[PDB]
Amino acid sequence: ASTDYWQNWTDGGGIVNAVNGSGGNYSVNWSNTGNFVVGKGWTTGSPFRTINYNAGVWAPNGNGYLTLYGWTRSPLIEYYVVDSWGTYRPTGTYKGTVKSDGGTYDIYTTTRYNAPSIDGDRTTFTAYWSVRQSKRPTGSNATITFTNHVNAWKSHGMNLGSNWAYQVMATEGYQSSGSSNVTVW
C-alpha cells in the first residue's frame, strides 16, 4: 500500500538528517540528539491494518527504536510495536504477552508526564507497548499484523481512542547517534 504520511519530528537537539525517499522509503542519520521520531505511514491509522516493512539499514549507536508508532485521541494514547532497538530495550508495567508474525512480544503500559503530545504543548498521557522479547532480524521483509496487538491489548483493559491519528513505521531516538533506512508498504 502507498504511504501517504511523512513523520519528521525533532525536539531540536543535535543533528537529524531525515530523508523523504521515493515511495515508502526513508532514511535517517542522527547524531547527539535529544528526542526525535521519523517515519512513513498513513495519515489515518486503523486497527485492521497490516504493516509491511524492510529495514535495509538498522544501525543505532545507542538508544533508538525501530517500531510501529501511532496515536489516538479520545482518549489521547501513544502506542508502539517495537521490533528492534539499540542499547536499551523499552519496558514498563508488564501486562502479558502476544505472539504475532513469528515473534513473541511483551505487553507494557507506561505513563508519560508533562510530555510533548501529538497536539503540541505538554500533557500527561498513557502509552501502550508491544515489545519483542528478542530483536527482530533486519534486512528482510517483515510484517506487523496490528490487529493481533490491538486484540491482545483489549484483553488487558488496554483500549485505544475513537479518533485515529497517524500510524507510521518509525525510527525513534533518544540522546544517541545512528543510521536507519526503512521501506514501508
Swiss-Prot record:
Keyword field contains Hydrolase: yes
Top EC class for this record: hydrolase
Active site: 78 (nucleophile), 172 (proton donor)
Residue stretches making up the GH11 domain: 1-185
Record carries keyword Cytoplasm: no
Superkingdom assignment: Bacteria
GO biological process annotation, one example: xylan catabolic process
Pfam families: Glyco_hydro_11
Alphabetical keyword list: Carbohydrate metabolism, Glycosidase, Hydrolase, Polysaccharide degradation, Signal, Xylan degradation
Swiss-Prot/TrEMBL catalytic activity: Endohydrolysis of (1->4)-beta-D-xylosidic linkages in xylans
Enzyme Commission code(s) on record: 3.2.1.8
Annotated metabolic or biological route of this protein: Glycan degradation; xylan degradation
GO molecular function: endo-1,4-beta-xylanase activity
Family listed: Belongs to the glycosyl hydrolase 11 (cellulase G) family.
Name of the molecule in the record: Endo-1,4-beta-xylanase
Organism the protein comes from: Niallia circulans
Taxonomic lineage: Bacteria, Bacillati, Bacillota, Bacilli, Bacillales
